[PDB]
Amino acid sequence: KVFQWFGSNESGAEFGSQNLPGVEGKDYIWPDPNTIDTLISKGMNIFRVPFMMERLVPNSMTGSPDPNYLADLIATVNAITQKGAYAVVDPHNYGRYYNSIISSPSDFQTFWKTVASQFASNPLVIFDTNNEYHDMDQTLVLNLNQAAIDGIRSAGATSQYIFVEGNSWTGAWTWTNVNDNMKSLTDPSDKIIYEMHQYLDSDGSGTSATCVSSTIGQERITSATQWLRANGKKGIIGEFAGGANDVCETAITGMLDYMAQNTDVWTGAIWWAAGPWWGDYIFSMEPDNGIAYQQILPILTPYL
């Protein structure tokens, strides 16, 4: 309706990061297609699916994928795209593999050719280079994103959008002085979308249900909005959340209303997060008992 994309993260496959490979059903779990369907009936048209690089391609990122984990990733993606919604494949790794910084763009490109080959003919799949790069060289971050793009396109996956992420946990509030060099990324398909994340608590970590103020969302994405416009780029808020309270609800509405007046650069937003194992999580958007699903979704309807 208002935005090109509006949806939620579907977390679970990246749980229990300390347990590798880990056991499905105990350490991690895949999203429930039944509840995803409920969110789609509500108007959401995009779902981000985090997964661990080490579980998909064990030991070496240039190796063969694990058939079982890959099977569930494919099943989850199709469940989403068969409904006409977009599925974002997200290696939720923070620019690290087995907790070591990914320092080889060539190996990363190979990893991406491998992943892209599995979804090359699906136009509704969106590739996310990596979740929240941080505390690493800025030129390396640029090179890793470019390597991902090169790998994806080399696989023949030319119709899909690619979400690139920056340094400093790809935060919107710190984008301009840290990630300026990201404007140099190139894509022969010209379908790069700059993905930023923005939380509303004190340190922007998204660990507290309390929001700084009723206007903090708008404040924190203003500079990024101007950067996107000045450089002729498009962006998306890949993660955002706020507690189920007055101040946060006002901040969320204010942020989304601001974005709605700047759709020339903002393509939409994705909530963090839905998923089957959140329980009483302060930001759970999982039907039908998630607190965000019951109290926040109602205020998001005007954008759906």
Task: Look up residue 34 and give its two tokens.
Answer: 């039944």
Distance between CA atoms of residues 255 and 185, nearest Å:
27
Task: Look up residue 125 and give its two tokens.
Answer: 């799949």
Residue 56 neighbours by CB distance under 10 Å: 22
**Cβ atoms of residues 240 and 271 within 8 Å:** yes
Cβ contacts of 177 within 8 Å, gap of 6 or more: none
Distance between CA atoms of residues 9 and 7, nearest Å:
7
| φ, ψ (nearest 5 deg) of residue 177 | -90, -10
**Cβ atoms of residues 51 and 73 within 8 Å:** yes
Task: Look up residue 114 and give its two tokens.
Answer: 């491998």
Task: Work out whether strand 235-241 and strand 192-199 pair parallel, antiparallel, or are unpaired.
Answer: parallel
- 3-class DSSP string for the chain: CCCCEEEEEECCCCCCCCCCCCCECCCECCCCHHHHHHHHHCCCCEEEEEECHHHHCCCCCCCCCCHHHHHHHHHHHHHHHCCCCEEEEEECCCCEECCEECCCHHHHHHHHHHHHHCCCCCCCEEEECCCCCCCCCHHHHHHHHHHHHHHHHHCCCCCCCEEEECCHHHEHHHHHHHCHHHHHCCCCCCCEEEEEEEECCCCCCCCCCCCCCCCHHHHHHHHHHHHHHHCCCCEEEEEEECCCCHHHHHHHHHHHHHHHCCCCCEEEEEEEEECCCCCCCCCCCCCCCCHHHHHCHHHHHHHC
Query: Angle at the Cα of 279 (from 276 to 282), degrees rounded to 5?
Result: 115
Which of 62, 70, 42 is CA-nearest to residue 105? 62
Which of 287, 281, 268, 285 is CA-nearest to residue 85? 268
- CA torsion angle 111 114 120 124 (round to 10): -50
Which of 146, 79, 85, 154 is CA-nearest to residue 115? 154
Task: Look up residue 243 and give its two tokens.
Answer: 């507690």
Distance between CA atoms of residues 86 and 59, nearest Å:
30
Distance from CA of residue 237 to its chain's centroid?
8
Residue identified by tokens 């650069």 is 265
Q: Which active-site residues does the annotation give? A: 132, 239
Residue 178, judged by CB atoms within 10 A of its CB (0-12, 13-18, 19+), counts as middle
Q: Which CATH superfamily is domain 1-304 in?
A: Glycosidases (3.20.20.80)
101 bridge partner residues: 96
Domain ranges of the chain: 1-304
**Cβ atoms of residues 278 and 291 within 8 Å:** no
**Cβ atoms of residues 235 and 194 within 8 Å:** yes
